[PDB]
Amino acid sequence: KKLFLVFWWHMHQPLYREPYTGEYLLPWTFFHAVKDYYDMPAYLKDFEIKLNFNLTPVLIDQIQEYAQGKAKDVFLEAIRKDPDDLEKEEVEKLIEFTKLNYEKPIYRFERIRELMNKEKLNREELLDLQTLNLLAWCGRTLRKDLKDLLNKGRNYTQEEKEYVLNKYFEIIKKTLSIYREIKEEGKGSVSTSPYYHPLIPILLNPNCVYETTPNVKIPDFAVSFREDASKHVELAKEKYFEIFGEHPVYMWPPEASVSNEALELYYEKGINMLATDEVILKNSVERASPYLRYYFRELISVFFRDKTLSDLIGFSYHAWNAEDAVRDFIGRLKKIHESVDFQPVVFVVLNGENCWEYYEENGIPFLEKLYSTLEKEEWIETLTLEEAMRKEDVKTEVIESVKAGTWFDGNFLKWIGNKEKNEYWKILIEAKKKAKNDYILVAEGSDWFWWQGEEKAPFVEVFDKLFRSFVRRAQE
Numbered sequence: 133k134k135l136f137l138v139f140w141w142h143m144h145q146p147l148y149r150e151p152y153t154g155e156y157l158l159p160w161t162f163f164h165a166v167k168d169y170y171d172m173p174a175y176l177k178d179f180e181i182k183l184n185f186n187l188t189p190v191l192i193d194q195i196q197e198y199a200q201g202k203a204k205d206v207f208l209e210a211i212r213k214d215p216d217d218l219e220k221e222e223v224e225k226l227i228e229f230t231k232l233n234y235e236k237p238i239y240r241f242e243r244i245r246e247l248m249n250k251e252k253l254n255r256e257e258l259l260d261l262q263t264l265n266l267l268a269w270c271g272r273t274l275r276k277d278l279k280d281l282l283n284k285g286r287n288y289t290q291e292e293k294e295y296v297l298n299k300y301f302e303i304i305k306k307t308l309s310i311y312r313e314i315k316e317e318g319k320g321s322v323s324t325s326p327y328y329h330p331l332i333p334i335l336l337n338p339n340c341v342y343e344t345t346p347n348v349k350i351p352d353f354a355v356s357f358r359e360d361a362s363k364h365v366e367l368a369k370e371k372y373f374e375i376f377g378e379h380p381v382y383m384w385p386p387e388a389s390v391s392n393e394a395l396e397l398y399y400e401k402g403i404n405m406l407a408t409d410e411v412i413l414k415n416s417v418e419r420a421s422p423y424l425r426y427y428f429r430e431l432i433s434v435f436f437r438d439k440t441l442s443d444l445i446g447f448s449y450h451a452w453n454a455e456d457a458v459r460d461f462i463g464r465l466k467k468i469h470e471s472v473d474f475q476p477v478v479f480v481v482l483n484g485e486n487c488w489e490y491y492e493e494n495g496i497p498f499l500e501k502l503y504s505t506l507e508k509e510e511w512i513e514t515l516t517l518e519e520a521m522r523k524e525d526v527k528t529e530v531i532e533s534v535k536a537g538t539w540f541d542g543n544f545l546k547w548i549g550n551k552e553k554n555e556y557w558k559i560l561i562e563a564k565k566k567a568k569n570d571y572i573l574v575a576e577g578s579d580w581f582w583w584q585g586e587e588k589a590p591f592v593e594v595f596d597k598l599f600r601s602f603v604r605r606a607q608e
């Protein structure tokens with residue numbers, strides 16, 4: 133009697149490439165590529181477990197552009213430059229970027245503390261601010277190759293900074309190839325999402341927000357987004373086919389977001405399985421074990437992720453010592469294993485790249501001990517998505533209806549409902565009426581709506597500039 137464990141790491145970045153300049157206005161795709169996007173599947177080179185990944189098509193596009201040397205990244209060019217060439221604006225952005233990340237364990241260099249406490253910074257000190265910002269984002273693989281430069285911690289030279297940059301781009305050039313390798317070797321399944329990570333239930337039917345939050349106020353949806361919803365799925369199938377040579381049969385719905393109508397659309401588009409959140413299941417069915425494989429109207433398979441286990445990794449364990457975290461996690465799986473007489477299916481689903489910067493040493497002690505301990509347990513079998521979908525010694529249930537929602541509280545409040553978020557929607561609506569190209573799809577990305585209506589942060593105006601730029605480009 134086994135416990136079936138399914139990791140599904142979700143990887144996504146909105147499009148940071150401003151369409152009129154062609155400049156990546158924020159370096160987050162670059163930094164999560166050198167840190168997480170190659171390195172998370174690369175664990176499968178050293179650990180005999182199965183791990184699954186979701187890659188949004190918008191993120192693949194950007195990875196492709198950095199790998200080909202075509203991405204113009206404004207923050208990165210400030211890193212690359214000799215400090216005597218830096219503009220005041222670039223020094224300010226570099227300082228600003230440092231203090232935004234200052235308290236994260238991956239930024240714990242004593243030299244950073246010194247530089248931050250300083251007045252003007254000289255050339256040698258600016259070189260250390262440049263290179264320490266680079267090295268802070270170093271992934272598992274290169275933390276070994278560059279071990280001597282990391283321990284240096286100070287007094288970097290331009291030639292060392294450039295050495296680091298070269299190795300970083302070699303990692304990006306390797307990144308799509310390793311997803312294809314782990315997929316081919318049977319070590320994991322790779323899924324994708326609708327192209328630009330939109331909220332499909334809202335695009336299909338904005339009134340679905342009233343299934344959970346009846347008092348919410350939303351704008352006048354005077355145009356249809358239903359065919360755009362199909363295009364996000366269709367175009368995602370094409371990009372996935374280009375990269376992996378098949379149409380995708382698994383998708384991760386952005387924000388775990390599902391509705392009756394979105395489930396039908398995914399079925400119509402050839403998706404045979406997805407996952408969503410335990411809160412959705414609880415809202416939808418009285419009798420709700422998340423350890424079953426569900427079938428929505430016998431049309432499509434649906435797993436409901438284990439919220440607590442997913443939140444332990446994403447919310448709790450950054451604050452723990454790795455050993456104590458791993459023993460806690462294994463203990464919890466053991467109680468699940470002992471809590472049922474059948475073989476449960478346990479889906480651990482979260483973002484694969486955002487929680488590790490808050491762990492000591494980028495979560496590497498945690499994940500290396502987690503994966504090493506998992507591969508030791510005879511009563512745990514980790515599954516690819518393909519295996520979880522076809523596994524026969526698993527218990528099963530049909531579900532006929534779901535209450536539309538997301539994995540944020542089971543509702544849509546974080547993307548629609550207040551004055552500022554609603555304004556983005558009205559802008560989108562008006563613009564959809566005048567749209568002439570696919571940049572309107574870019575503007576339908578969830579991320580724009582998330583950041584709006586709650587600014588208060590360093591760099592959030594960049595997301596607003598991107599959204600409005602895409603909205604403007606869509607009408608030309």
Ligand SMILES: OC[C@H]1O[C@@H]2O[C@H]3[C@H](O)[C@@H](O)[C@@H](O[C@H]4[C@H](O)[C@@H](O)[C@@H](O[C@H]5[C@H](O)[C@@H](O)[C@@H](O[C@H]6[C@H](O)[C@@H](O)[C@@H](O[C@H]7[C@H](O)[C@@H](O)[C@@H](O[C@H]8[C@H](O)[C@@H](O)[C@@H](O[C@H]9[C@H](O)[C@@H](O)[C@@H](O[C@H]1[C@H](O)[C@H]2O)O[C@@H]9CO)O[C@@H]8CO)O[C@@H]7CO)O[C@@H]6CO)O[C@@H]5CO)O[C@@H]4CO)O[C@@H]3CO
Nearest residue numbers: 142144145146160232387446483486540578579582589591
């Ligand atoms: O759009 C850009 C980003 O896109 C991508 O993200 C999307 C995901 O892909 C998508 O799946 C989804 O994510 C959901 C997520 O998976 C769920 O976990 C949840 O989010 C919760 C989160 O995980 C929790 O941490 C918690 O957050 C609280 C936190 O606990 C608390 O400490 C505090 O946060 C402060 C931080 O501690 C501090 O770091 C800082 O935050 C800064 C940040 O440091 C800084 O770097 C910058 O963030 C960058 C980010 O680093 C970049 O990588 C890039 O992000 C993209 C992701 O990489 C994608 O995967 O751009 C960001 C913006 O520049 O700026 C931050 C500003 O604050 O200060 C923090 C201020 O809070 O508070 C929080 C809140 O309680 O709970 C979260 C839920 O509230 O739900 C997600 C949405 O459903 O959506 C992603 C966004 O679109």
